[PDB]
Design a protein around this nucleic acid. Structure first.
Ligand code: CL
Length: 309
DNA sequence: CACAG
C-alpha cells in the first residue's frame, strides 16, 4: 500500500464534494509532469492526505486507478489554465476533526521529507504542485500528529484493499487454469466466500463460534485460518483450515486484530482499540485447544496475518 | 514546469 499527498488549495471543495482527484495529463505547454504522471501510479486502497489552506483535511482511500476524464466544469475560473484532457481518480474522502498544520510541526517531520519531489520545503511551506509520493516513515509521523482518526482509515480498512485485489486476480487465474477440472474451479471460487465443500468439511470439525459460542448456522461465517489468497488448492478446501465465527469475530480474526495461541489463548493486537472488545462484550482468555492440523494453519495466522508493531 | 504562498 502506498501513501500520497494531494495539494488541493484551488479546488478542495469541488474535489471533496465530487469524491475525486483530477489533474491534466500534461503541463499546459504539452510537456510531461512528474506530479500528473503520479496519477497513473495510484492503486485502489492507497491512502491520500488532502492538503488545502495549509491544513490536512482528509485521510482518503483511492477506489480506482486513474481514468481519462475531462476537467470538471465546476472548477470554473479557479481551473482555467489546466488542459481539459485529464486523469480522474475516485477518492473516498474521510474528513478529520484534527486538521493538522504541517508547517507548525516542521521540526518533527523535516528529517522524513524525501530528497526529491517533497510536498513541503524545509521551512514547512508547501510546494506548488498537485500529487506527491509520501514515504512510509513520513506517513507514520503525519498519522502520529493527526491521531486515532487517521489510524482508523488505514489499519484493517485502507490496507485490506490490496489484499482483495490480489485475491480477485487469483480467482481469475483459477477460472483460466487448464490443470484443474470444472468442479475444482467451482469449489475453489466458492471457498473464498466460505461456501461449497469447504463449509461442509469445516462443519465436520467445528460446530460453534470459538469466542461467542453461537451454534446457529445462519449466524456463523466459515472463515479460513491460513487466508484463501496464500493457501494452495488443498489448503483452500481443507476443513481443518477454518473456524466458524460470528461476523464481528470473523472481522477481527480475518484482519489480524486478534489471533490464537495453539492452546486457544486469544492474542489481541496493539492495533485493536480495547474499547471494541468492551463495546461487543468479548473477554480476553482461553477459547479451547486447536487440533494439530489447525495449529499448523494458526501458526501461519500468528506469523503473517496478526497485526504486530 | 508548477493545486502554495
Ligand atoms: Cl482511461
Amino acid at each position: 500500500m502506498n501513501y500520497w499527498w494531494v495539494s488541493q488549495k484551488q479546488t478542495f471543495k469541488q474535489e471533496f464534494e465530487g469524491g475525486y482527484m483530477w489533474s491534466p495529463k500534461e503541463n499546459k505547454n504539452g510537456t510531461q509532469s512528474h506530479y500528473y504522471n503520479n496519477m497513473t501510479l495510484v492503486q485502489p486502497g492507497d491512502v491520500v492526505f488532502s492538503f488545502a489552506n495549509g491544513l490536512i483535511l482528509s485521510v482518503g482511500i483511492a477506489r480506482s486507478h486513474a481514468y481519462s476524464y475531462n476537467k470538471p466544469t465546476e472548477f470554473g475560473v479557479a481551473g482555467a489554465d489546466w488542459a481539459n484532457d485529464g486523469w480522474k481518480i475516485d477518492l473516498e474522502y474521510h474528513l478529520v476533526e484534527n486538521k493538522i498544520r504541517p508547517k507548525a510541526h516542521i521540526d518533527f517531520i523535516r528529517p522524513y521529507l524525501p530528497q526529491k519531489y517533497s510536498p513541503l520545503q524545509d521551512n514547512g511551506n508547501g510546494n506548488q504542485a498537485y500529487l506527491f509520493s509520501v514515504p512510509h516513515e513520513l506517513a507514520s509521523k503525519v498519522v502520529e500528529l493527526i491521531g486515532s482518526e487517521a489510524e482508523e482509515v488505514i489499519f484493517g480498512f485502507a490496507d485490506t484493499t490490496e489484499i482483495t485485489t490480489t485475491a480477485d486476480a487469483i480467482e481469475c487465474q483459477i477460472s483460466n487454469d487448464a490443470s484443474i477440472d470444472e468442479t475444482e474451479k467451482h469449489q475453489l471460487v466458492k471457498s473464498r466466500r466460505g461456501q461449497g465443500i469447504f463449509r461442509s468439511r469445516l462443519e465436520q470439525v467445528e460446530s460453534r463460534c470459538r469466542v461467542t459460542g453461537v451454534q446457529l448456522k445462519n449466524h456463523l461465517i466459515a472463515s479460513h485460518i491460513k487466508p484463501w489468497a496464500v493457501s494452495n488448492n488443498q489448503e483452500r478446501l481443507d476443513g481443518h483450515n477454518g473456524l466458524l465465527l460470528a461476523p464481528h469475530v470473523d472481522h477481527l480474526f480475518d484482519k489480524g486484530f486478534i489471533s490464537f495461541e495453539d492452546n486457544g489463548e486469544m492474542i489481541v493486537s496493539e492495533k485493536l482499540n480495547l474499547d471494541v472488545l468492551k463495546a461487543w462484550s468479548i473477554s480476553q482468555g482461553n477459547y479451547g485447544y486447536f487440533s494439530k492440523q489447525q495449529q499448523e494453519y494458526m501458526c501461519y495466522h500468528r506469523e503473517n496475518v496478526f497485526k504486530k508493531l
